[PDB]
Amino acid sequence: LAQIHASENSKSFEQIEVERALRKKYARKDEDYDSMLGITRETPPELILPDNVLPG
Amino acid sequence: PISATMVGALLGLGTQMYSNALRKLPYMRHPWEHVVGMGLGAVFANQLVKWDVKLKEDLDVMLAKARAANERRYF
Amino acid sequence: GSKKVSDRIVKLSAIDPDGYKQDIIGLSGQTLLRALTHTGLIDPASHRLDDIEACSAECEVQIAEEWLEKLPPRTYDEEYVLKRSSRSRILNKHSRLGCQVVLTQELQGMVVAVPEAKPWDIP
Amino acid sequence: SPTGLPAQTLIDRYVTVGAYSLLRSCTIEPECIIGQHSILMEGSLVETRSILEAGSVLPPGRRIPSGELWGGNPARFIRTLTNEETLEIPKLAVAINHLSGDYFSEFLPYSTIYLEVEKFKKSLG
Amino acid sequence: MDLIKYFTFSMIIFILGIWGILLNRRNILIMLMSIELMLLAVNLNFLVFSVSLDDMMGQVFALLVLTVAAAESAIGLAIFVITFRVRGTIAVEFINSIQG
Amino acid sequence: KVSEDKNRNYAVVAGVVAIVGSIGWYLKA
Amino acid sequence: MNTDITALEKAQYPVVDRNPAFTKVVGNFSTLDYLRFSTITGISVTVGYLSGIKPGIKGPSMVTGGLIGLMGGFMYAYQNSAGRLMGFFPNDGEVASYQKR
Amino acid sequence: LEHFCECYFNLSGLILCPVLGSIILLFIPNSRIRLIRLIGLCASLITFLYSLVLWIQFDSSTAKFQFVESLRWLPYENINFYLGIDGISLFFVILTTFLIPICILVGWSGMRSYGKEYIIAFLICEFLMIAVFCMLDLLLFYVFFESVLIPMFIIIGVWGSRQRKIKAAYQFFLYTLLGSLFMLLAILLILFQTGTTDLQILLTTEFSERRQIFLWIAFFASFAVKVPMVPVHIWLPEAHVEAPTAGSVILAGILLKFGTYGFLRFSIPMFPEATLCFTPFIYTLSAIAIIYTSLTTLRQIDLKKIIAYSSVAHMNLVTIGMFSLNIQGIGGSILLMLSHGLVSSALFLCVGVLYDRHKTRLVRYYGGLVSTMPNFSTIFFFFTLANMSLPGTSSFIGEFLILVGAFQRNSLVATLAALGMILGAAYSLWLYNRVVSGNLKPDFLHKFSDLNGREVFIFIPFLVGLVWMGVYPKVFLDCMHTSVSNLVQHGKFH
Amino acid sequence: VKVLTYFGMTLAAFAFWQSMDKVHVWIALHQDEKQERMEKEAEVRRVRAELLRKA
Amino acid sequence: MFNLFLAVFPEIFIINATFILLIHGVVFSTSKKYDYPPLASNVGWLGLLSVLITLLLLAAGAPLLTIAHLFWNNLFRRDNFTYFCQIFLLLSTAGTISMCFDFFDQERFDAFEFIVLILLSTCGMLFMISAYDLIAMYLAIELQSLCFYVIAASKRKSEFSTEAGLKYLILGAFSSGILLFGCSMIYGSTGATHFDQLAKILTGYEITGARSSGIFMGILFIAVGFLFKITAVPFHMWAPDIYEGSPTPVTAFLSIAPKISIFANILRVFIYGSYGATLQQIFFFCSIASMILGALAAMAQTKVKRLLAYSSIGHVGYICIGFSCGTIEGIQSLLIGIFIYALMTMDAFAIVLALRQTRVKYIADLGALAKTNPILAITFSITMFSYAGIPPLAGFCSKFYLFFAALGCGAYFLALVGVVTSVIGCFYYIRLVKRMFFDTPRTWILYEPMDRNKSLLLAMTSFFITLFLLYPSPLFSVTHQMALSLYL
Numbered sequence A: 001l002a003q004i005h006a007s008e009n010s011k012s013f014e015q016i017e018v019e020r021a022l023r024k025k026y027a028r029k030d031e032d033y034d035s036m037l038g039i040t041r042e043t044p045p046e047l048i049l050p051d052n053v054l055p056g
Numbered sequence B: 001p002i003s004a005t006m007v008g009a010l011l012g013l014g015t016q017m018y019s020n021a022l023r024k025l026p027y028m029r030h031p032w033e034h035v036v037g038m039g040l041g042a043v044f045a046n047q048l049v050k051w052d053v054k055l056k057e058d059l060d061v062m063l064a065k066a067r068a069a070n071e072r073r074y075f
Numbered sequence C: 001g002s003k004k005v006s007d008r009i010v011k012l013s014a015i016d017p018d019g020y021k022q023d024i025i026g027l028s029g030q031t032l033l034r035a036l037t038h039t040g041l042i043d044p045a046s047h048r049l050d051d052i053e054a055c056s057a058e059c060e061v062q063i064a065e066e067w068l069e070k071l072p073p074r075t076y077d078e079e080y081v082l083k084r085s086s087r088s089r090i091l092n093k094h095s096r097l098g099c100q101v102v103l104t105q106e107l108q109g110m111v112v113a114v115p116e117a118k119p120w121d122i123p
Numbered sequence D: 001s002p003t004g005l006p007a008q009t010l011i012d013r014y015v016t017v018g019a020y021s022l023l024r025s026c027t028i029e030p031e032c033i034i035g036q037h038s039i040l041m042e043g044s045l046v047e048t049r050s051i052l053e054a055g056s057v058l059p060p061g062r063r064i065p066s067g068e069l070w071g072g073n074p075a076r077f078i079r080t081l082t083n084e085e086t087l088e089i090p091k092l093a094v095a096i097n098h099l100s101g102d103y104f105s106e107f108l109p110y111s112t113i114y115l116e117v118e119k120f121k122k123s124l125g
Numbered sequence E: 001m002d003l004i005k006y007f008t009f010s011m012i013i014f015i016l017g018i019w020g021i022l023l024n025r026r027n028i029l030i031m032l033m034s035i036e037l038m039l040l041a042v043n044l045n046f047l048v049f050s051v052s053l054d055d056m057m058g059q060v061f062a063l064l065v066l067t068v069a070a071a072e073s074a075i076g077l078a079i080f081v082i083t084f085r086v087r088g089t090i091a092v093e094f095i096n097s098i099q100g
Numbered sequence F: 001k002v003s004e005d006k007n008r009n010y011a012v013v014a015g016v017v018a019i020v021g022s023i024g025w026y027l028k029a
Numbered sequence G: 001m002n003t004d005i006t007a008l009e010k011a012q013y014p015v016v017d018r019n020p021a022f023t024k025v026v027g028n029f030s031t032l033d034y035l036r037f038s039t040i041t042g043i044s045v046t047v048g049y050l051s052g053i054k055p056g057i058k059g060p061s062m063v064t065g066g067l068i069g070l071m072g073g074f075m076y077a078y079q080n081s082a083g084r085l086m087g088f089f090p091n092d093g094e095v096a097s098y099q100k101r
Numbered sequence H: 001l002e003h004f005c006e007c008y009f010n011l012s013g014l015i016l017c018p019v020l021g022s023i024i025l026l027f028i029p030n031s032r033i034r035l036i037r038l039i040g041l042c043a044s045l046i047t048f049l050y051s052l053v054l055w056i057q058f059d060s061s062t063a064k065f066q067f068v069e070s071l072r073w074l075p076y077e078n079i080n081f082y083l084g085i086d087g088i089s090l091f092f093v094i095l096t097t098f099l100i101p102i103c104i105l106v107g108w109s110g111m112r113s114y115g116k117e118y119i120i121a122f123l124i125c126e127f128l129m130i131a132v133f134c135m136l137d138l139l140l141f142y143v144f145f146e147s148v149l150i151p152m153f154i155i156i157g158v159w160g161s162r163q164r165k166i167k168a169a170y171q172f173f174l175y176t177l178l179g180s181l182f183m184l185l186a187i188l189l190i191l192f193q194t195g196t197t198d199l200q201i202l203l204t205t206e207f208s209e210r211r212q213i214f215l216w217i218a219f220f221a222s223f224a225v226k227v228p229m230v231p232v233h234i235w236l237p238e239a240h241v242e243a244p245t246a247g248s249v250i251l252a253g254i255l256l257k258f259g260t261y262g263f264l265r266f267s268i269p270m271f272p273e274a275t276l277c278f279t280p281f282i283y284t285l286s287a288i289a290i291i292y293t294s295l296t297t298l299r300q301i302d303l304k305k306i307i308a309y310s311s312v313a314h315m316n317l318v319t320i321g322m323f324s325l326n327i328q329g330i331g332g333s334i335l336l337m338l339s340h341g342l343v344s345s346a347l348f349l350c351v352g353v354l355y356d357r358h359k360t361r362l363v364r365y366y367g368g369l370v371s372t373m374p375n376f377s378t379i380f381f382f383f384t385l386a387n388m389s390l391p392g393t394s395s396f397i398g399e400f401l402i403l404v405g406a407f408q409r410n411s412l413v414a415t416l417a418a419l420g421m422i423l424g425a426a427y428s429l430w431l432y433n434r435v436v437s438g439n440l441k442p443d444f445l446h447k448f449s450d451l452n453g454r455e456v457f458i459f460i461p462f463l464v465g466l467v468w469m470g471v472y473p474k475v476f477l478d479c480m481h482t483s484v485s486n487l488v489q490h491g492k493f494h
Numbered sequence I: 001v002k003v004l005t006y007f008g009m010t011l012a013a014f015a016f017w018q019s020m021d022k023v024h025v026w027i028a029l030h031q032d033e034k035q036e037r038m039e040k041e042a043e044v045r046r047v048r049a050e051l052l053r054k055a
Numbered sequence J: 001m002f003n004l005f006l007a008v009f010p011e012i013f014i015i016n017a018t019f020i021l022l023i024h025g026v027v028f029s030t031s032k033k034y035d036y037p038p039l040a041s042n043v044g045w046l047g048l049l050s051v052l053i054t055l056l057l058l059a060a061g062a063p064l065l066t067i068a069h070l071f072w073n074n075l076f077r078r079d080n081f082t083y084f085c086q087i088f089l090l091l092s093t094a095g096t097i098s099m100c101f102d103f104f105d106q107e108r109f110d111a112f113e114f115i116v117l118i119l120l121s122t123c124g125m126l127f128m129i130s131a132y133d134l135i136a137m138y139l140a141i142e143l144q145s146l147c148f149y150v151i152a153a154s155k156r157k158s159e160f161s162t163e164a165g166l167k168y169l170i171l172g173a174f175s176s177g178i179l180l181f182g183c184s185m186i187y188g189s190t191g192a193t194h195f196d197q198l199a200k201i202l203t204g205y206e207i208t209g210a211r212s213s214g215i216f217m218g219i220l221f222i223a224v225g226f227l228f229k230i231t232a233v234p235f236h237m238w239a240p241d242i243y244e245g246s247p248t249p250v251t252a253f254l255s256i257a258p259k260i261s262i263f264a265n266i267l268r269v270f271i272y273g274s275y276g277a278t279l280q281q282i283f284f285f286c287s288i289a290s291m292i293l294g295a296l297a298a299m300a301q302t303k304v305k306r307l308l309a310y311s312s313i314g315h316v317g318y319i320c321i322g323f324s325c326g327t328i329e330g331i332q333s334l335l336i337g338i339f340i341y342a343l344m345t346m347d348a349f350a351i352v353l354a355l356r357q358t359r360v361k362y363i364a365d366l367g368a369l370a371k372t373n374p375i376l377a378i379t380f381s382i383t384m385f386s387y388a389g390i391p392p393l394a395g396f397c398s399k400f401y402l403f404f405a406a407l408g409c410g411a412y413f414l415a416l417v418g419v420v421t422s423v424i425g426c427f428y429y430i431r432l433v434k435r436m437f438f439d440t441p442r443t444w445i446l447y448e449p450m451d452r453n454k455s456l457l458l459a460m461t462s463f464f465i466t467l468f469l470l471y472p473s474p475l476f477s478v479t480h481q482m483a484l485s486l487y488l
């Protein structure tokens, strides 16, 4: 838990803004229109937590 | 007294505060928008009164034509 | 501490549409639907209130007869909802509305069958 | 949770959690009051229309029955609440919300700190 | 007696469309096809009437109706395809969820 | 010293033209 | 093709030209006509820019909005000028350049 | 035709006062309880004082509508509307303005949980009700009366005590809407003849006998649901009992008067032949209701159900007097209307005092309150006496003057109506003794508090009002007699 | 269906259409009677109206 | 030659703008450079701009729309009535589009083609209003219907949306075939399709004994198609299912825009035409059936959308009563009712779309709304009391005219039906107020606050509803103006 908190608290202004935009862009989904377009939208790695902090 | 400009400005102010309240925001969240709303309400009220006058003027002529046509039957 | 959450805990088992049996946990005094939604057996979003007026049989369960004796009999509104929500418009004699079943200590060990979920998210 | 129930921390409506209280994976049903400096541990449940005294300690998985006053370390039954007492609880929540509104009006949507950062940068070239 | 016979030809096509609606509770594809029969019967009436009255307005509308029939068949079969894809079957017991 | 986003500059000019044109439209009508 | 400009409701102002040509109508544009055209084009470009920021295409969105605005603004100005020249709208200016010229 | 009055104090400002109060309150934060309370109370008090001034400038010699003023609806001026009062409606306006501040004062202690929504609803009710009492048009009467249903619905449903308030509010809204729709049908029927709905005009237009009968039946259906008359009286018990105390006060003190006021303002004068043909029918329904509903009141076990059931008997005596069509009958009917609006409200106030402390309405739980609440017991006894039409109280003046008017027309209806004296005394004294007299029951109730300073002040204007009209009713009868005389003489010329 | 079933159905339908032709001829042959009946009924209505308009 | 097209500047502009938006959306939605951005909101804003510019072009060039009327005569006819009807239609389209942006963003409906189909259906309804021939009327109706069929199935993976699309397509094609049959019968009997030629041939005879059975049945079948279109009983059962199953913006658009376009068509085909009271009896009986069925079925509903659908059916019955009576005031009151119902429906659907961010589905979901959002609960109650017809709210005009026409046209059964249905409607409308204000549920639903568009539209519609009767003259005069433009 310390690792994820230390990573988040040390981010610079520019990275904070980039990840705010990413979080907004990937908050919802329209996989149906993606399938019509023939594309698959993937969650960027900066928004994925390590497996060692997940409940599973 | 009570004029179209005053009523329209008050209604524009009321709409902005009603819109802020529907969004659970403070009444005076963006006061420049209140100024804009008062201006728009005043413009809309003056235009509405003028339009009502014009509409009544046009309806009078059209009713004149209708009555002339209906009075043609008794000739 | 004299009073414990385990006093209200009612053991249960649920058989999913694919047939695999799961031991689930619910509080007496709450509905069977809430116990079923704790582990996601029934999607909580599909049935957010425990009211008969907010039910399209999303909470429907099937219960064998040995446990139906231990429950209050179905009211007219429940049977109306079950019958209309059936695909064939046939009332199922073992069917119950999970939002109307209140868990009690007398329901320990009861087996419940969870049918396949109906569509519920109206566009 | 040791009870097996979902371990989310749920503070329902009209709940007054007194200052310096520690909550972890506890459920508080609507219209309750938690006394100052109380501790609610994992899986514990406080049923609706209950009051915990200041300094109370609720061990893991323990329960506060509805319509009662409890307190102590560990929490023990004190007495049963009168109906007027239970009517007082949402009133306390509403009053605290009214007080918080006075603090909410002290802040505009943006701070002016960014100007201080600007000038602290400018002085530094 | 020419006109009455042409008209009864169109009439039987329209009636067959109505009957196809009545007789196919469980077959919605044939319900669509019955509707297409009704549209053909109307298109023929316009042509027959245009010939009978010596007037070209019937034929212009006959061409435009053929365009409408084509578009409506295309979109209808699209809706059929998506319904089938979602359910995996065309049986009418799986398209009755909306009711009341 | 200079604003570099050329699309933003064009949009700013467009908004200014809209405002000034609205004012002139009212004044000459 | 037989054509007939005859309108249902008669003009209420002096008819300077009953069927003015395209180039004549355009050459009849007043400063008010250019003001209406520029306002509509500017508003359209602004809406294109503001609506295009979220998808990330503010430039192309500005272009599309500006095309819609140019089309609509020309249409509105041509409408006003032609209606003035045909006497459907108050056209004291057109009558001045007709009595004089 | 502009009819603007020359008087400084006019109907328009009295109408605007509570509207301004409501508009001001919508914007004040609910956190500012002290300010909200004081604004509402001050607005209602100013309105009451304005109504008193309106009383001061009243002319008791004229039969012409007074303070008449007009308001334009269209620039075509085809449809123009008028406001005016007479000797028949003045006192009802004053009563409305007196009762509203009482309603604000009743919920003073709970205004932290009520909020601006409570004061706003009562102010909107006040504005609509005064408007209704001040109209010289059949159409505006319908709109403003039909409009009072929304705030009363809200008041019953939100601040009612139990879950029975759902059914009660439903029945109230639906019964009143049915009656109002029937009135609307009558208003359009009149409009098709006359081309207008102006009272001053329709008073001068003759209606055929057949159309008089039909228009009377449609006006009857509307007014008889609001009187109330048997058998459409059953909405009143649930509605008046389930409502909050101030809601009950408004429902019984003001809203009940709209039907009998509609008989006096429209049905009786406009259709004088239809009125005569239907007098035996009115007499039968009124006399049945007095006897039946008084015996029902005897067997009620709920404090509020007894008081609410009492109003049905009193209003049907009012209908008897007003259809007697003489000075004593109509003058007595109006006086009982105002007196009932004071006695019934005070009795609802007495029960509300008891329910606020103990949260029960069952009579069997109380008893022996004289030894713990002597001040409440003394005030409860006075208003209990005023409900029995005891001479000296205001309600005796209206009751006897109606019996005088009924006796000169039909002796039989006067005798059946006079049975209200025996039955009215039976349940009123039974209620008082079962609640106040006897021994305490500490297993049910062991903690008591007599009236506080606010509750004492609330009752004082009620006590002064009933004694004043009871011993010297000339101040009221002086200002009513010319309007009453012209109401009776309407339609005949000998 | 079998080919012969289809052809038997076509023969039945041909007989049905010839019967329809007979029906159309019959309907054509009774135009004069129908117009005569229409005229008599119209005269009845007109006489009744003229006699009722008298009062 | 160019100046002849001044009569069709609005349609030319809106069609060209729709083409531009189609190309823009397809070019940039497929772009890898911009990571295939959703463009529903971008195209939606540009299309709202296009609709507003079309409205400006139409409103400002009021006399120019009648230019070259002889040249355009065999294609359409533009007059005062069509002018105001088209302005109303454009305003309705603009409001409906403005209510869609939160749905595009939060649901992530990324299809920009939804906006394009709405724009094309708007072009179709524009052409419907100005139609003056059976051929043009049918073609414009069909363009409109095809757009609606496509958008009703826009959530192509949803069982409800696909089911609604299928039922819509089948029943709409059936009714369209019936109407086309009616047109063919009329053409064969009269040798004409232009509305003027039909007016001349039919006037003066109606049913004079020797009655053209072809003209009768043509009128009958065309009326059946129109009654299907206005959701009138017994051609109504598609509407509740389609309204419920379609996406909520689709339902909002279908509940307002198509009624204006088809009532314009009904008034120009029959009132401007000539036949016996048979058609008036058709609409009379359909109005009575619609009021009764709408009231009872709405009383049975537990879901908000189905309740609104049945309420709309009841109100079209109330409106068609005005068509049946066949007077100038009947047409005026029909127009007034359509206007007020459109504004009230937009108010209600703005509230429903605001609550759909939290997935409101049942009436019971509105429990404790007076606590969690007091101003919103009051706004919805003002709308519900307007729906019930309680004065002084704007909804009272429809009730007033319903009873006025009945006691004038001499009807008393109609008055009885109106009274009973009004009381039933009041009950099931105030049930929603009781749910938001009186109930104390164990579990609450906390709703996300609405966006600025819906709040502004809600504030304006709420002010109109509460205050229209204080200054109603412009609507009365403009509707009277339109009613007379139909005949003279």
Ligand SMILES: C/C=C/C(=O)SCCNC(=O)CCNC(=O)[C@H](O)C(C)(C)COP(=O)(O)OP(=O)(O)OC[C@H]1O[C@@H](n2cnc3c(N)ncnc32)[C@H](O)[C@@H]1OP(=O)(O)O
Binding pocket: C001, C002, D024, D041, D057, D059, D060, D062, D073, D074
């Ligand atoms: C992944 C991250 C991990 C972390 O970092 S943990 C984060 C912070 N969480 C914590 O610190 C939780 C610590 N857990 C505990 O303290 C806990 O109590 C504890 C773990 C001692 C004890 O918890 P128990 O449930 O196991 O308590 P007992 O079984 O021993 O009960 C004995 C008795 O003591 C009494 N009771 C027990 N606990 C206490 C106390 N403390 N005081 C007073 N009285 C008590 C009580 O009367 C009990 O009787 P009953 O109620 O009839 O069962």
Ligand SMILES: [Fe+3]
Binding pocket: C047, C051, C052, C054, C055, C056, C057, C058, C059, C060, C097, C098, C099, C100
């Ligand atoms: Fe359920």
